[PDB]
Each structure stands twice: as structure tokens, then as C-alpha cells.
Design a protein around this ligand. Structure first.
Ligand code: NI
Ligand code: NI
Ligand code: NI
Ligand code: NI
Ligand code: NI
Ligand code: NI
Lengths: 277, 9, 100
């Protein structure tokens, strides 16, 4: 299977206070499993899935200190970028950092990531070759030059090809029962009058893992409709996901429309239509 | 487990 | 900072039945800056014990977060999520729909 380990890091400078708000969330696939928050009563690296609670206190001690060390680096980097851009201290800015590895079914590395954004726009990113960088303006050009001079690429490449892959393998073994599973969706269509001559048909998918899913609607014999109301796939809160797709159809011609549901846990799609009570 | 280094910007 | 305005979904974990305990979710996605205030309300009153998930972000750097609380739907009570964010002149209230 395709599997990924990713860490999402956000630092938010505070005008008036000196220490920024620092958040790290860790994900295997779509399942979050660790968290660090600056603004906790005692800022520690904490479990967010029960299967990571299989790690001894040395794991939690190393990860807490490294999270804490990262926060001190992200405080400095935020100060560096304040000067690069000639900005003032009485306004808030953010530095975001995503990194981690996609591994394939054989368990070999497919893509590694190490990318950052300032104020939510691309800043610097590590290229797919894991050896060169892409910058986006004058300021990231300086950062890129700094990083070329200290061979930052080979330090990140080392992480992504080694520990990221090996740690991902360990987590997939600790959380095998919940991470290496496919829960197919359960699906139905609901019916809601929208006007006099019209009706809203909504195709529900519920209770599925992983998160990736596709819903299509079509008028039978016609190509798929792009004219469609979608919601973002959303978490149920229990580890599964939900989604719906809606379409507005003429009163009386409901049964001429068909929903399809595609998911990794479905050898064939589900095929649903409105079924009157 | 987290990376050891972040780039110095 | 472009400023991205929050997309809010208010929905129950399980299909609702009057009288049966449940979990009410407020999912807020695709917003920027990350600073946001989320309140879950019952009959316009602030629900006290509201679980807040960790802020992460999407492939386009946009932020997302989940609020949730235990609740028992009844045919009279009304539920909503109110969100304040810099992209919005006013705080936005999205009411729970028993058929989303
Ligand atoms: Ni503190
Ligand atoms: Ni930028
Ligand atoms: Ni070296
Ligand atoms: Ni078991
Ligand atoms: Ni606030
Ligand atoms: Ni809970």
C-alpha cells in the first residue's frame, strides 16, 4: 500500500510577547498520532492515537526535547525573516513546515518532503531530487544560499531516506490493526425539496477509512455532472470520514440520476439512486 | 519520530 | 497573507435520533491567518466543555481544525457553531441541520 509519515509545524509570532506559539502534529497517512503545543500547561510531546502509547518514556523524552529545540529554532527563523522583509514587531507572522516520506507498497521511499511557507505563501522547498532547493523571492533566495553553503539538502535527504522510512515501518507495525485496514463507505441518497419544480439529491458516504474517496452523479446516459455541490471530506471524530455530493433535479425525474462511490476498500464502486419510501 | 534539523533560514 | 475565509461544517458523528446521545462536530477548513475563535452553542448559549483538536494545515498551507462536544439531540433544542476570524467583518454562525 501507499503510506506516508508527515509532520506539520506552525510557529506564530506574538507582538508583545517574545515566545511564539509553536504547534507540531504528526500523521501516519490520515491518522494523527502525536502532538506538541507551545501553549500547554507543560508543553510535552503527547500521544494522539492509542497505538503510539506502546513507546517507552525514552521516546517521549527525546521527542519532547526535540520539539522544544525546534521551537527555539523557529523563534530565531521568524526573527531572521523579520529583517529580510524589513517588517515591524507589532504584527503577527507565521512559519509553516511540512516534511515526511511517502513509501510504496514494497516499503521503499517514493517522495520525501521538506517545504516551508511564510505568511501562508511558498517560501523555500526541497526539490524531488532531495539535493537542490526552490526559492520564491529575494528573502528565500538568501535562505536557499545559506542552505546550499551548509549542505542542508544532505541533512534532510538523510532523514527522509533513513529514519523517516524506518520510523514509518515501526509505526505501521505498532498501529497495524488501525492503520493497515480499509473500511469501505456505507452510502445512501437523501431527498430534499428545493423549489416547486425541483428537488435536491444528496449522496452520502459514511464510516470510511482512509480519507480518499470519490462521489459522482450523472443523469443516466449522460456524461458526469460537474454542476455539483461537494463538501470537504470531514472527520467523524472516531477515526472514519464522511462526505456527500448533491445535485438538483426535476421533481419526478429523480430515478434518472445515479450516484457512484469509489474508495480503496471497494473492489467495485457502489451504485445508488433515490429510492422512494 | 521528528527530524533532527530544520533549515536555518 | 491573502486572508482566506473559513469554511464551516456542523454535523453529528452519527445520524441523529431524538433522545440518543451523540457527538456534534464543527469542522473549520481552508482559512488564513491561523488565529481563529470557535464557539459551539446550544439555544444560542455557549456550550462549556468543547473539545478542540490540534490545528494542522493542508497542501496549500490553509489551516483546519475540529471542535466537538457530546450532545443529545431533541426535537426542540437548537445547535450551532459561531466562528470569528479576521477574514470576516462579523462572526459567522452556522446552525446544525438534521440532514446536513
Ligand atoms: Ni510555558
Ligand atoms: Ni513568501
Ligand atoms: Ni553530513
Ligand atoms: Ni487487537
Ligand atoms: Ni482569540
Ligand atoms: Ni471526545
Amino acid at each position: 500500500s501507499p503510506h506516508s509519515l508527515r509532520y506539520f509545524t506552525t510557529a506564530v509570532s506574538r507582538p508583545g510577547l517574545g515566545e511564539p506559539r509553536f504547534i507540531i502534529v504528526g500523521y501516519v497517512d490520515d491518522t494523527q498520532f502525536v502532538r506538541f503545543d507551545s501553549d500547554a500547561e507543560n508543553p510535552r510531546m503527547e500521544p494522539r492515537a492509542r497505538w503510539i502509547e506502546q513507546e517507552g518514556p525514552e521516546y517521549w523524552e527525546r521527542e519532547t526535547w526535540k520539539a522544544r529545540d525546534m521551537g527555539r529554532n523557529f523563534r530565531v527563523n521568524l526573527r531572521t525573516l523579520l529583517g529580510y522583509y524589513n517588517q515591524s514587531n507589532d504584527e503577527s507572522h507565521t512559519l509553516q513546515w511540512m516534511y515526511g516520506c511517502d513509501v510504496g507498497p514494497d516499503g521503499r521511499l517514493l517522495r520525501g518532503y521538506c517545504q516551508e511557507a511564510y505568511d501562508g505563501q511558498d517560501y523555500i522547498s526541497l526539490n524531488e531530487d532531495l539535493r537542490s532547493w526552490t526559492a520564491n523571492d529575494i528573502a528565500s533566495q538568501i535562505s536557499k544560499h545559506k542552505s546550499e553553503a551548509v549542505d542542508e539538502a544532505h541533512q534532510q535527504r538523510a532523514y527522509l531516506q533513513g529514519p523517516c522510512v524506518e520510523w514509518l515501518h515501526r509505526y505501521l507495525r505498532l498501529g497495524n490493526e488501525t492503520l493497515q485496514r480499509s473500511d469501505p463507505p456505507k452510502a445512501h441518497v437523501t431527498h430534499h425539496p428545493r423549489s416547486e419544480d425541483e428537488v435536491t439529491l444528496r449522496c452520502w458516504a459514511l464510516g470510511f477509512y482512509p480519507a480518499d474517496i470519490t462521489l459522482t452523479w450523472q443523469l443516466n446516459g449522460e456524461e458526469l455532472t460537474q454542476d455539483m455541490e461537494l463538501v470537504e471530506t470531514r472527520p467523524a471524530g472516531d477515526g472514519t470520514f464522511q462526505k456527500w455530493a448533491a445535485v438538483v433535479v426535476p421533481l419526478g425525474k429523480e430515478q434518472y440520476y445515479t450516484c457512484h462511490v469509489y474508495h480503496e476498500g471497494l473492489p467495485e464502486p457502489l451504485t445508488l439512486r433515490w429510492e422512494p419510501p | 519520530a521528528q527530524a533532527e534539523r530544520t533549515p536555518e533560514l | 497573507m491573502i486572508q482566506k475565509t473559513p469554511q464551516i461544517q456542523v454535523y453529528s458523528r452519527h445520524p441523529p435520533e431524538n433522545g440518543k446521545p451523540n457527538i456534534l462536530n464543527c469542522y473549520v477548513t481552508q482559512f488564513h491567518p491561523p488565529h481563529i475563535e470557535i464557539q459551539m452553542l446550544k439555544n444560542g448559549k455557549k456550550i462549556p466543555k468543547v473539545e478542540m483538536s490540534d490545528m494542522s494545515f493542508s497542501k496549500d498551507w490553509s489551516f483546519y481544525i475540529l471542535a466537538h462536544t457530546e450532545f443529545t439531540p431533541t426535537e426542540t433544542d437548537t445547535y450551532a457553531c459561531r466562528v470569528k476570524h479576521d477574514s470576516m467583518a462579523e462572526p459567522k454562525t452556522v446552525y446544525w441541520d438534521r440532514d446536513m
